[PDB]
Ligand binder design. Structure first.
Ligand SMILES: [Cl-]
Lengths: 216, 217
């Protein structure tokens, strides 16, 4: 583990060694726009903006990515819902339940599954307004995502319309599935997770054990 | 007949294109006039008059883009992967996969350009005769422009050549980068890469590809 200083809150950013190559523009990019982000109450709170940088990248082969945090109650861990109330994490868990057969569980977290890094493209939003901080995170978001995609084999984005713009880099397998909170798309939502393992050892990589996310 | 044309300063002097390509045609002309002079110094694959013949293709009926990094080092026809005498290993290897998938054992050739819903595409539209990826420096911005235009229409982009498509950025579409068709025994991965395209098309709720349409008897 490592650490850097920034001009505004959260003042300090702790990060895993794998993130070193991009940390120097991150600091420069953040100081430029940080003043704007902190004008607003955010999801998550500033102290939790960068906590996913503590994650290693070399052991990751799948990135499950949403466009930005929950409009409220963000934790800094993408999709995480401590009391298991957010529709997204509830719907994701349902899909995994139908794929694995696990029926009894109390919660689910993408951040405890070997080889998976859960990621939010924009790292904050004005409380209650999705994609409201897109203009600020822009250069940071491209910088970080591109760093992720050189390590992972499969990038799985959630939100067809959410990811309507946004550039990504080759070669990475990239699927844009339906947002977990989207209406009757249970069939396609389920098989999107299922197809990820098929794709992973097309690239001859170990499958993902999605059942590891369950909280009992 | 649903067709248009523009003038460029250098060979092939005229570019014919389908209406679907209109939005990018003025930047194409501006970009091409910039680099054509250096480009034509070289003998190319394909010949200049066949650089842009894929622009005659409609895009509104396309849902899959099968893409190579650039034309064959030699004997390029302007139609991506196409080999009239069926001798290039890429199209021979592609035909095998489709044969293994569909059950068609008897055929004399194969062409991706006769499959409904499929546009075969070369990322760079030419190369110095015998040298792969050699015209990247010229096609650079044209290539980004055209591919981005294709991907706002297709649902699945299937690029062939893991190392070939490194460093290249595209816009969000389901995107698969498979092995180069001419790679040695990656038969399992070559095969299920084509097979998974219809699966992904049905994840996006689009009609499947009839890959057997490519066969020439
Ligand atoms: Cl979140």
């Amino acid at each position: 583990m490592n650490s850097v200083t920034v001009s505004h809150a959260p003042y300090t950013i702790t990060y895993h060694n794998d993130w070193e190559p991009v940390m120097s523009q991150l600091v420069e990019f953040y100081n430029e726009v940080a003043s704007w982000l902190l004008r607003d109450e955010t999801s998550p709170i500033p102290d939790k903006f960068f906590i996913q940088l503590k994650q290693p990248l070399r052991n990751k082969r799948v990135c499950v990515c949403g466009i930005d945090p929950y409009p409220k109650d963000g934790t800094g861990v993408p999709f995480e819902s401590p009391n298991f109330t957010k529709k997204s994490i509830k719907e994701i868990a349902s899909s995994i339940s139908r794929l694995t057969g696990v029926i009894d569980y109390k919660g689910y977290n993408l951040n405890i599954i070997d080889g998976v890094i859960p990621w939010n493209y924009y790292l904050s939003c004005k409380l209650g307004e999705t994609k409201s901080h897109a203009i600020y995170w822009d250069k940071i978001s491209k910088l970080l995502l591109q760093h992720i995609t050189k390590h992972v084999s499969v990038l799985y984005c959630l939100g067809k319309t959410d990811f309507s713009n946004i550039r990504a880099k080759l070669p990475v397998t990239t699927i844009v599935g339906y947002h977990p909170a989207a209406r009757d798309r249970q069939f396609e939502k389920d098989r999107s997770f299922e197809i990820i393992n098929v794709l992973l050892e097309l690239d001859n990589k170990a499958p993902i054990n999605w059942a590891q996310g369950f909280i009992y």
